[PDB]
Design a protein around this ligand. Structure first.
Ligand SMILES: Nc1ncnc2c1ncn2[C@@H]1O[C@H](COP(=O)(O)OP(=O)(O)O)[C@@H](O)[C@H]1O
Ligand SMILES: [Mg+2]
Ligand SMILES: [Mg+2]
Ligand SMILES: [Mg+2]
Ligand SMILES: [Mg+2]
Length: 222
């Protein structure tokens, strides 16, 4: 077997997050929104599906900004309450296919935590999963190779990793790795992406939000 551990010492270190309260979630939202805003022109230029109308980044940015502004004006330590504020802002500001889907992903995420004051890594993962289920149900004819695919693959990664990972920083790092793998695979699912030579614009915007989430978990700003 192993050495039977009985030391009274508690491990040292401070660069881990085991609980996410409403203010940390707000910081995630704010940095995710800022990172998306900084990448909006690129995300627009990648847009080819359904139509190459140059707007995915703008659409997602405006949607996320509506959520961010509600959050900044109504902060709370209670993550469930903060999520209600964020969800409302997204849902009253959603634009484009991408912004509608984004608002539905986060509607499901936030509903899953509505009665919590803080969440751990397992509940974070479960909430990404809940968001994916809400978004697929909201789209009448889901297509693979899109923001839905990337969100789905990210949530599957989250559930697998959280089962043995208490640290939300490590969890979010892994989610981003796997979301990026999914995003790079989108042209293998959706023909126009491969023909033009781009990844999915909605999925890229979602990865920008997730990368801001990670920055906030580390106590950093975009
Ligand atoms: N049926 C669908 N299933 C999954 N994702 C979709 C669908 N339709 C659009 N999208 C997502 O939206 C992105 C384009 O967003 P956007 O430019 O806002 O669209 P639009 O200009 O058509 O409203 C795509 O990259 C894709 O991920
Ligand atoms: Mg459009
Ligand atoms: Mg478009
Ligand atoms: Mg670490
Ligand atoms: Mg690949």
């Amino acid at each position: 077997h192993h050495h039977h551990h009985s030391s009274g010492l508690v491990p040292r270190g401070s660069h881990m997050i085991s609980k996410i309260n409403g203010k940390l979630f707000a910081d995630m939202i704010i940095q995710g929104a800022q990172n998306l805003s900084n990448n909006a022109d690129l995300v627009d230029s990648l847009n080819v599906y359904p139509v190459p109308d140059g707007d995915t980044g703008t659409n997602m940015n405006l949607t996320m900004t509506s959520g961010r502004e509600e959050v900044e004006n109504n902060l709370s330590k209670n993550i469930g309450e903060l999520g209600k504020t964020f969800s409302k802002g997204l849902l009253m500001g959603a634009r484009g296919n991408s912004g509608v889907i984004l608002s539905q992903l986060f509607r499901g995420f936030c509903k899953n935590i509505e009665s919590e004051s803080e969440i751990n890594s397992k509940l974070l993962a479960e909430s990404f999963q809940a968001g994916v289920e809400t978004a697929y149900k909201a789209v009448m004819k889901p297509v693979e190779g899109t923001i839905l695919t990337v969100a789905k693959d990210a949530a599957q990664a989250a559930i697998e990793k959280a089962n043995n990972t208490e640290d939300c920083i490590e969890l979010m790092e892994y989610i981003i790795v796997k979301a990026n793998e999914s995003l790079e695979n989108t042209p293998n699912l959706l023909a126009v992406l491969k023909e033009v030579g781009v990844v999915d614009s909605g999925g890229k915007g979602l990865l920008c939000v997730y990368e801001g989430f990670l920055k906030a978990l580390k106590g950093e700003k975009v």
